[PDB]
Amino acid sequence: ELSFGARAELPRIHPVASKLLRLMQKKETNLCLSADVSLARELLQLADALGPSICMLKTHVDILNDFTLDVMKELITLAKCHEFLIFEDRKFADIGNTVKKQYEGGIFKIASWADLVNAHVVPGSGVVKGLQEVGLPLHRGCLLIAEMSSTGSLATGDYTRAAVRMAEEHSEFVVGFISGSRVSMKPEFLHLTPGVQLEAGGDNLGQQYNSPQEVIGKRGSDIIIVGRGIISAADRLEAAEMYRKAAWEAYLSRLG
């Protein structure tokens, strides 16, 4: 096993993955904030205050009540300042011809501001081929959804294996996975894991939690994605620091 900083230099590394791994190493953070808020001002105030603590900020811009492209310009300023990537959690999941338009166009123009997006693999590899027609020229990366943290997830078994093959066959655009554990043996691929809280439990709509120590340390993932464990806390900066320290130490202990 290689450090994040060494993985950033692997021959086949994608440039977006390399940038991410280098800032993870520099800042001692493998935390992705899931900025699940409906107000632009709250999104930007969280990005500014928590920026030093995170490697990545994950958006759902289709839940912002006051989205504009100017908001995303301001988010990019903060991402550049504090050094984190922007990941729009759009879960593209249509045929290739449709997802290319959903990625480039409409009101959101996702490809213009998102370093990373993700896709479900259920449509077959055309979903990746459609996204990459927009994302390759714009030097973007994509994450494939190999597993989900929710109760009754069908992203298991042969479905998960199909995601790894699709990633490993589109490695010029696909930089890794959303997964609950390491699913690829290739160190060039990132593993990002949602369904993370310090305490046991879940929500009332199928979300299930595991700890940073479990998912980074035992399950071999790279990055934790944390929403409500931070966002619902009173002091979101201290909460982010607790999650950062948990994920970072779990990584160091597994690296040995």
Added chain:
Amino acid sequence: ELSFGARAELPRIHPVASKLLRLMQKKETNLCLSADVSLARELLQLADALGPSICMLKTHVDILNDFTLDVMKELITLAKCHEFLIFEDRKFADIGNTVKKQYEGGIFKIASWADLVNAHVVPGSGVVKGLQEVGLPLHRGCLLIAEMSSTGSLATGDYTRAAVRMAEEHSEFVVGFISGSRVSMKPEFLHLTPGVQLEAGGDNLGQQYNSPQEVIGKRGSDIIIVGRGIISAADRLEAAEMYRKAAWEAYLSRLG
């Protein structure tokens, strides 16, 4: 097998399914236009001209360059005038807590104007439970994606069976399927089939076509979803009429 008009009266029919089946019977149409355009004016001019020929208009509002809620008000006026349902093809595919916000909120406020939406079943039944928290109070319906028409689709076998069970267990909100064929034996559920053209072939991003006669007549589906076979034709009204007549006659011949 029952006619559309008789299915509209089944004991367990959902009100949105009943409204749809009654207007299908009245208008002799089982065609859903896939209005895959980027301009509001083109969307509205297609809705007005083709409204009499269709049972449903399927949107991707995240591809409109000039989306506003006023555009959707104008679309509703046309839907009421010509008698068709509005189906936003959003393919919700997140955990329940996230999809409820994506359905109700953000810029699009999908639940405020869409009679129907669809969901992938990959997250497990929490995706339906989250949508239904918004959609049940608003008297909306949902379609579950049981199959996809694209090359390499993983919506097969046990995945398709899981979609049918999830639909049949959330029948107060789920009104049917996106599928390539009949997948439920319960006549209360609608089957809508994309990947339809009169001529053989596909696109260069994994789309595959079958004919209206094949999918309605042989494969037992209810409604054809047609995008480019209409949208790319010079005369979209004549193209819509050719698809309507094809799908309607295939239905009548199987009913016998």
